[PDB]
């Protein structure tokens, strides 16, 4: 069984960490009798320098034709002062739109070995294990109309439109339901239905889908209360589904709650077609080339690729297990270094994970 | 020096806690050569039973003619099944609009005696002391157009409009700058300027007002990063100003981080005119009449009334100091009780705070 995978090294530490994840993905796959055809393509800063835009059509083609996409990082000092349309970040937005990956999955789990990195007390942080499923390509970030107008009274007025069509809510909810089935069967839908008409429609559509997934325990929660519950009792959550802006905010909160941002993977899924998998950390221009980067998030992203992309559990478990073994053996990169542990560079951490995969 | 104060006891524990704050307010003021004329008016459930609506015109009149308004709580089981316009909560929204209190001030402070109530580790929670200044009467919660429409396909579309005019942003920012001057002179403006035109205008207006408050240290922060920063290092914040929806979310998060919701006061201020002061907790229908309520939030709201409402700094300090003394003596109502303290009822806690004031 051969899969085609598009690699998007990108910028800063991206290539370093994608390279390691590639090898990890290859070994874990091999053990489960799975081989891969890898092709690297330009995106972000690297695409700008090479082609002159952040996402060349050739990259979209390769991604669309492959079975899954693994992305490193995007961004850097050099391109920060570019026109918005020519910024690296614009390439991320474009690839998401091109692949139609409307569903962003960010698992926030506190690993037994890293409990102390969280600013929450141990008994609260330990065993946190939640998944935020965030609507990724619609909502207020892309809503119309939008703009800054001057109302002929000379005064400027700024506006944006939070808007969802029923079919947009249906498809993100289904993914969430299917995702809860792959976890603990508990789904919490988060909105502002006590005030916003868009949230009322959100809640109506999710509520109606419940009968199609009767095995899943559905609940509802207001976004302001969810922001409190994440701080008070994050262990209550399994899977959460929510819109683009609430998802952006609540996922970041949950990420910081886990304590180690450099350990967190992400997956962006579409209805059919290849998904896009990347660590949530940025390109970390400062430590690029210095062998300091933490490759665990990208590795764990390769594990999400196997699981949510290719439906290859086992191969995925091998990766997750090897990450644990490495941490169990006391290995830590700078961002997760703790008193008494073994500080290591990116390369060496990669090697320790590869070593466990055998 | 004589002030007129409108008391809105409201529902559930409202009357209980306002009654105690009234007396505390009276004693603290008396010590500073300040007397008050109090007048109680109906709002919420109580107004519904008595007059038929959540906010009678007479209540609006009294509130407008007074120097400040102290509100208890709104809501109860009995009225939960009412039509929207006749829910108690409608009365809150209406009175805010009537008084034009566009600025909601919510101080989130961790009291030395109550540090362990927070789910954050001690060294992170201790000394947290921030103020969320939230735009209260505009933004997406009141934005037009809004609705759920059916498009040509028979498919429903739900929408809301996040919109601010320049003058709406100016006035909430000015209050925030003024508020930071009464604290530690640090103001962080929170928006989503990297994506939303409304936040771009927000940031432009706040940025232009900086020169008019050169003494205040202004910084800007994206709402998603703020949600992380409240978890990672909430002590970094002094004053935060932000829009209605982000302010609602970030303040609730900050409140839960403090660990003790029953201790948290609030102030809603206008350009000129009486402010509205109220505890952020609800009406707690479950414990009404049982002498269990924590009156400290309403008492501390009376302290805010004195300070932010009437500019009576000294009288306000007397209240804040007495609350501390009571807690130092080990007194705790159910919601703040811990091992080794003196569990007390609402009445008795009131009595201890009064004792300290003299």
From Swiss-Prot, chains A, B:
Changing residue 96 to A: Loss of activity toward 3-isopropylmalate. Regulated by a thiol-based redox modification. One of its GO terms (biological process) is embryo sac development. It catalyses: (2R,3S)-3-isopropylmalate + NAD(+) = 4-methyl-2-oxopentanoate + CO2 + NADH. NAD(+) binds at residues 74-89, 194, 225, 278-294. Pathway: Amino-acid biosynthesis; L-leucine biosynthesis; L-leucine from 3-methyl-2-oxobutanoate: step 3/4. It comes from the Eukaryota. Disruption phenotype: No discernible vegetative or reproductive phenotypes except a slight reduction of both male and female transmission efficiency, but decreased leucine biosynthetic enzyme activities and lower free leucine concentrations. The double mutant ipmdh2 ipmdh3 is lethal in male gametophytes (small aborted pollen grains abnormal in cellular structure, and arrested in germination) and had reduced transmission through female gametophytes (slow embryo sacs development). Changing residue 192 to M: Loss of activity toward 3-isopropylmalate. The record marks 188, 346 as: Essential for redox regulation. One of its GO terms (cellular component) is cytosol. Homodimer. This is 3-isopropylmalate dehydrogenase 2, chloroplastic.
């Amino acid at each position: 069984k051969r899969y085609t995978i598009t690699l998007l090294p990108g910028d800063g530490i991206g290539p370093e960490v994608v390279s390691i994840a590639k090898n990890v993905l290859q070994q874990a796959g091999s053990l489960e009798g799975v081989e891969f055809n890898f092709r690297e393509m330009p995106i972000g800063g690297a695409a700008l320098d090479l082609v002159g835009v952040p996402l060349p059509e050739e990259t979209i083609s390769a991604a669309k034709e492959s079975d899954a996409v693994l992305l490193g990082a995007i961004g850097g000092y050099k391109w920060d002062n570019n026109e918005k349309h020519l910024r690296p970040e614009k390439g991320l937005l474009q690839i998401r739109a091109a692949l139609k990956v409307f569903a962003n999955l960010r698992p926030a789990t506190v690993l037994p070995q890293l409990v102390d990195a969280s600013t929450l007390k141990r008994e609260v942080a330990e065993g946190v294990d939640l998944m935020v499923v965030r609507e990724l390509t619609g909502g207020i970030y892309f809503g119309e109309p939008r703009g800054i107008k001057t109302n002929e009274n000379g005064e400027e007025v700024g506006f944006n439109t939070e808007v969802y069509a029923a079919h947009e809510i249906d498809r993100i909810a289904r993914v969430a339901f299917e995702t809860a089935r792959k976890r603990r069967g508990k789904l919490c839908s988060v909105d502002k239905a006590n005030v916003l008409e868009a949230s009322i429609l959100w809640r109506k559509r999710v509520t109606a889908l419940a009968s199609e997934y009767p095995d899943v325990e559905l609940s509802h929660m207001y976004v302001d209360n969810a922001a409190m519950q994440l701080v008070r009792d994050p262990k209550q959550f399994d899977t959460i589904v929510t819109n683009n802006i609430f998802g952006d905010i609540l996922s970041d909160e949950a990420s910081m709650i886990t304590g180690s941002i450099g350990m967190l993977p992400s997956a962006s899924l579409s209805d059919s077609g290849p998904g896009l998998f990347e660590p949530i950390h940025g390109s970390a221009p400062d430590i690029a080339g210095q062998d300091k980067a933490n490759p665990l998030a990208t590795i764990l992203s390769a594990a999400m690729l196997l699981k949510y992309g290719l439906g290859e559990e086992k191969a995925a478990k091998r990766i997750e297990d090897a990450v644990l073994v490495a941490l169990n053996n006391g290995f830590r990169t700078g961002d997760i270094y703790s008193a008494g542990t073994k500080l290591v560079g990116c390369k060496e951490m990669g090697e320790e994970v590869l070593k466990s995969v055998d």
